[PDB]
Amino acid sequence: MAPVPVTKLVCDGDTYKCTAYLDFGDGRWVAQWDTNVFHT
Amino acid sequence: MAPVPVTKLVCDGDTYKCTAYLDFGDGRWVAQWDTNVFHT
Amino acid sequence: MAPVPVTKLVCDGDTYKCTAYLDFGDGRWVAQWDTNVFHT
Ligand SMILES: CC(=O)N[C@@H]1[C@@H](O)[C@H](O[C@@H]2O[C@H](CO)[C@@H](O[C@@H]3O[C@H](CO[C@H]4O[C@H](CO)[C@@H](O)[C@H](O)[C@@H]4O[C@@H]4O[C@H](CO)[C@@H](O[C@@H]5O[C@H](CO[C@]6(C(=O)O)C[C@H](O)[C@@H](NC(C)=O)[C@H]([C@H](O)[C@H](O)CO)O6)[C@H](O)[C@H](O)[C@H]5O)[C@H](O)[C@H]4NC(C)=O)[C@@H](O)[C@H](O[C@H]4O[C@H](CO)[C@@H](O)[C@H](O)[C@@H]4O[C@@H]4O[C@H](CO)[C@@H](O)[C@H](O)[C@H]4NC(C)=O)[C@@H]3O)[C@H](O)[C@H]2NC(C)=O)[C@@H](CO[C@@H]2O[C@@H](C)[C@@H](O)[C@@H](O)[C@@H]2O)O[C@H]1N=[N+]=[N-]
Ligand SMILES: CC(=O)N[C@@H]1[C@@H](O)[C@H](O[C@@H]2O[C@H](CO)[C@@H](O[C@@H]3O[C@H](CO[C@H]4O[C@H](CO)[C@@H](O)[C@H](O)[C@@H]4O[C@@H]4O[C@H](CO)[C@@H](O[C@@H]5O[C@H](CO[C@]6(C(=O)O)C[C@H](O)[C@@H](NC(C)=O)[C@H]([C@H](O)[C@H](O)CO)O6)[C@H](O)[C@H](O)[C@H]5O)[C@H](O)[C@H]4NC(C)=O)[C@@H](O)[C@H](O[C@H]4O[C@H](CO)[C@@H](O)[C@H](O)[C@@H]4O[C@@H]4O[C@H](CO)[C@@H](O)[C@H](O)[C@H]4NC(C)=O)[C@@H]3O)[C@H](O)[C@H]2NC(C)=O)[C@@H](CO[C@@H]2O[C@@H](C)[C@@H](O)[C@@H](O)[C@@H]2O)O[C@H]1N=[N+]=[N-]
Ligand SMILES: CC(=O)N[C@@H]1[C@@H](O)[C@H](O[C@@H]2O[C@H](CO)[C@@H](O[C@@H]3O[C@H](CO[C@H]4O[C@H](CO)[C@@H](O)[C@H](O)[C@@H]4O[C@@H]4O[C@H](CO)[C@@H](O[C@@H]5O[C@H](CO[C@]6(C(=O)O)C[C@H](O)[C@@H](NC(C)=O)[C@H]([C@H](O)[C@H](O)CO)O6)[C@H](O)[C@H](O)[C@H]5O)[C@H](O)[C@H]4NC(C)=O)[C@@H](O)[C@H](O[C@H]4O[C@H](CO)[C@@H](O)[C@H](O)[C@@H]4O[C@@H]4O[C@H](CO)[C@@H](O)[C@H](O)[C@H]4NC(C)=O)[C@@H]3O)[C@H](O)[C@H]2NC(C)=O)[C@@H](CO[C@@H]2O[C@@H](C)[C@@H](O)[C@@H](O)[C@@H]2O)O[C@H]1N=[N+]=[N-]
């Protein structure tokens, strides 16, 4: 399948990005997107 | 609750989208967002 | 590490946002991003 599973998910409030580690290929591919981060 | 849990999370480096399967309703609802994808 | 793990992930089709609860600090920080939501 073209969509691949996420194995780990982290987010960073300095860069305002979330990074998803992917099960694909050699293991070094990530998905990353801009995000808001805040204290509730 | 209006926010619902994600049961599975996949991402696709051809479409540059991540898709989250949701526990809601009949089970066929997803959340989907644009994302970057790259090799580290 | 500056990226921190997500402990829970929910998404909301009224607000069109996904919210990731973060393991950080006092436990009340989230990441949140706009998302599409739809029935497949
Ligand atoms: C002691 C200690 O340590 N403590 C700690 C702390 O520290 C941390 O915190 C952190 O801190 C830091 C330091 O201070 C910081 O940093 C900073 O920042 C800032 C700000 O930022 C922002 O802005 C910017 C600009 O514009 C940008 O870039 C960024 O990015 C940001 O923004 C963001 O972004 C994002 C992404 O894009 C987005 O998202 C999105 O969202 C959306 C929505 O939106 C909204 C709406 O709704 O619309 C908007 C609005 O506005 C809002 N509202 C309000 C009211 O606010 C909303 C809300 O929020 C909601 O709704 C609720 O629900 O939202 C959508 O969702 C989408 O999808 C998304 O995507 C957002 O929005 C944004 N926001 C805003 C507000 O805008 C900055 O600015 C700065 O930078 C500066 O500085 C530096 C140095 O330091 C440098 O490097 C740079 O370059 C800069 O510089 C500058 O420059 C300029 C020009 O160039 C000049 O002019 C000047 O002068 C300079 N300056 C200097 C100084 O140099 C900085 O970076 C940060 O921020 C903080 N963070 C936070 C989060 O807060 C704490 C935390 O931590 C963190 O996180 C965690 C988790 C972990 O990771 C760790 O590690 C980290 O660190 O913690 C504490 N502790 N404890 N517990
Ligand atoms: C052997 C084998 O097979 N191998 C394999 C491979 O293949 C793969 O890869 C893949 O491949 C494919 C094929 O080649 C490709 O495809 C292609 O692509 C291209 C590009 O794309 C891009 O661009 C476009 C346009 O513009 C768009 O649409 C897309 O989307 C993209 O873009 C992107 O997007 C995203 C989303 O929106 C974004 O995100 C974002 O991000 C942001 C940030 O950003 C940034 C910043 O920061 O600012 C930016 C910058 O720039 C950067 N920088 C650099 C330096 O780069 C940054 C960085 O990255 C960072 O920062 C780091 O940290 O970033 C934020 O975050 C936000 O939030 C987000 O959202 C992004 O950004 C973007 N990027 C850019 C760069 O821009 C395209 O173009 C193409 O298309 C074409 O072609 C086709 C056919 O083929 C067709 O269909 C189409 O239509 C087109 O066509 C064309 O048309 C035109 C007009 O219309 C004309 O003119 C021409 O002529 C034509 N042509 C033809 C040929 O026809 C295609 O599609 C892809 O790309 C690739 N991928 C990758 C990822 O790389 C690999 C991988 O795989 C994948 O993934 C995985 C995971 C899984 O899923 C699988 O299954 C898949 O496949 O693999 C390999 N193997 N192994 N190992
Ligand atoms: C019986 C019962 O109960 N049932 C149930 C139901 O109900 C639900 O559903 C829901 O419902 C509700 C009620 O009806 C609704 O609400 C409504 O809505 C509407 C619409 O919204 C939209 O629009 C708006 C405006 O513009 C906005 O704001 C929003 O946000 C939305 O939009 C969206 O957004 C997002 C974010 O930003 C985005 O995303 C993105 O995406 C992208 C992509 O994109 C696209 C592309 O591709 O390009 C686009 C295109 O278009 C598309 N296409 C088509 C064909 O469609 C595509 C596709 O989709 C794909 O591709 C596929 O694959 O896509 C990327 O990805 C990025 O990254 C992202 O981010 C998106 O896009 C968008 N979309 C569109 C389409 O645009 C609205 O409008 C409304 O509002 C109104 O109303 C209210 C009241 O009610 C009020 O408050 C307001 O204010 C408004 O008002 C108005 O105002 C105006 C002015 O101001 C005036 O003029 C008027 O008159 C007024 N009116 C009145 C009435 O007042 C509302 O809000 C919703 O929507 C729904 N949802 C859904 C999801 O559907 C169901 C579901 O549920 C939910 O979800 C779940 C999961 C859970 O959470 C729960 O709890 C919830 O509820 O369910 C059912 N049951 N059962 N089974």
Q: Where do the domains of chain C lie?
A: 1-40
Environment class of B25 (CB within 10 Å of its CB; exposed 0-12, middle 13-18, buried 19+): exposed
**Distances, alpha carbon A16 to alpha carbons A19, B22, B40, C23, in Å:** 10, 24, 18, 15
**Maximum CA extent, chain C:** 38
d(Cα A2, Cα A18) in Å, to the nearest integer?
21
Strand (E) positions, C1-40?
Answer: 4-12, 17-22, 29-34, 36-39
Q: What's the reported resolution, in angstroms, to a tenth?
A: 1.7
Ligand 2 geometric centre to CA of B9 (Å): 20
User: Ligand 2 atom closest to Cα of A33?
Assistant: 68
Ligand 1 shell residues, CB under 6 Å: A 12-14, 16, 34-38; C 2, 4, 22, 24-25, 29, 32-34
d(Cα A40, Cα B8) in Å, to the nearest integer?
25
Q: In sequence order, which residues have a C-beta less than 8 Å from that of residue B7 and are 6 or more positions away?
A: B21, B22, B23
Is B40 touching A (CB cutoff 8 A)?
yes
Using alpha carbons, select from A11, A26, C11, C29 the residue that is nearest to residue B5: C11
Is B34 touching A (CB cutoff 8 A)?
yes
**Are B10 and A10 within 8 A, CB to CB?**
no
**Residues from chain B contacting residue A6 (CB–CB below 8 Å):** 9-11, 18
**Residues from chain A contacting residue B33 (CB–CB below 8 Å):** 33
